[PDB]
Amino acid sequence: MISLIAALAVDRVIGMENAMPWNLPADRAWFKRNTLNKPVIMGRHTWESIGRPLPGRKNIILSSQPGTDDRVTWVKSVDEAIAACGDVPEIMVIGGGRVYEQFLPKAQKLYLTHIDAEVEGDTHFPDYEPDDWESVFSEFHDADAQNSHSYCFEILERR
Ligand SMILES: NC(=O)C1=CN([C@@H]2O[C@H](COP(=O)(O)OP(=O)(O)OC[C@H]3O[C@@H](n4cnc5c(N)ncnc54)[C@H](OP(=O)(O)O)[C@@H]3O)[C@@H](O)[C@H]2O)C=CC1
Ligand SMILES: COc1cc(Cc2cnc(N)nc2N)cc(OC)c1OC
Ligand SMILES: [Cl-]
């Protein structure tokens, strides 16, 4: 099983200048929950965004160029990433825009955080047909002192 987990603003925005254009600790909490003790495949742009290994997960970076951090696994292809995760129950693909593009066709599950924010963005979740997917579970949260936007955590499964 391959799964994508991603936070989407109003216009499927996921990124602005190699950062998420919002601050939702409640999202980073939901991200940690569903990825922990599973392998994560991220693109080199996302690695640099996070800027440190994600504890309690084998970290797998996609980069044509050679590695620059001895604490994480590096791979130069999609097939190498996928192989690098090994015989596991679930592979979590955690960004960014170009990695999502490549993995979404392969993906069985979506872990979507829908954020009530119309924010300028250089990077968007790839398009898809909701025809192709069926809503499994969702959870709505109001904005609060720490999370300036309302948000909905959704899970979808292929057919
Ligand atoms: N909203 C959300 O849920 C999330 C937000 N983001 C946002 O996403 C943005 C980053 O997305 P984007 O700019 O598309 O980049 P990525 O984060 O997908 O990383 C791009 C890099 O990945 C490497 N790469 C990708 N595919 C391959 C491949 N098949 N073989 C080899 N290397 C590969 C390349 O590295 P190289 O240059 O070494 O060749 C490429 O330059 C940021 O703004 C970030 O904030 C990211 C995570 C989640
Ligand atoms: C743990 O912090 C980060 C996590 C992510 C990936 C990510 C974040 N949120 C969700 N819902 N899905 C994801 N795949 C991306 C990040 O930066 C772009 C992070 O830095 C704050
Ligand atoms: Cl690419």
Numbering used by the authors: 1 to 159
Give verbatim lines from the article.
TMP mediates its anti-bacterial effect by targeting bacterial dihydrofolate reductase (DHFR), a ubiquitous enzyme found in all organisms and thus also an important target for cancer and autoimmune disorders. DHFR catalyzes the reduction of 5,6-dihydrofolic acid (DHF) to 5,6,7,8-tetrahydrofolic acid (THF) by enantiospecific hydride transfer from NADPH cofactor. THF and its derivatives are essential precursors for the biosynthesis of DNA bases and amino acids.
To gain greater mechanistic insight, we next characterized the atomic structures of wild-type DHFR (DHFRWT) and mutant DHFR with an L28R replacement (DHFRL28R) using X-ray crystallography. Both DHFRWT (resolution 1.9 Å) and DHFRL28R (resolution 2.1 Å) were individually co-crystalized with the cofactor NADPH and inhibitor TMP. Distances between the amino acid residues of the enzyme and TMP (black values are for DHFRWT and magenta values are for DHFRL28R) indicated that there are only subtle differences between these two structures, particularly around the enzyme’s active site. The arginine side chain at residue 28 of DHFRL28R (purple in color) is oriented towards the tail of the TMP molecule where the 3,4,5-trimethoxy aryl ring is located. Hence, we predicted that a TMP modification with an appropriate polar group at the 3, 4, or 5 position of this aryl ring might induce additional electrostatic or hydrogen-bonding interactions and thus yield a L28R-specific drug candidate. Interestingly, unlike other mutations, the L28R mutation reduced TMP affinity while increasing DHF affinity. Our molecular dynamics simulations and biochemical measurements suggested that the L28R mutation leads to a unique and indirect resistance mechanism against TMP: increasing substrate affinity due to newly formed interactions between the mutated enzyme and p-aminobenzoyl glutamate tail of the substrate DHF. Also, in our evolution experiments, L28R was the most frequently observed mutation in the coding region of folA, with the strongest effect on TMP resistance. When we measured the in vitro affinities (Ki) of TMP and 4′-DTMP to DHFRWT and DHFRL28R using purified DHFR proteins (see “Methods” section) we observed that 4′-DTMP had nearly two-fold higher binding affinity to DHFRL28R compared to TMP at steady state, whereas the Ki values of TMP and 4′-DTMP were comparable for DHFRWT.
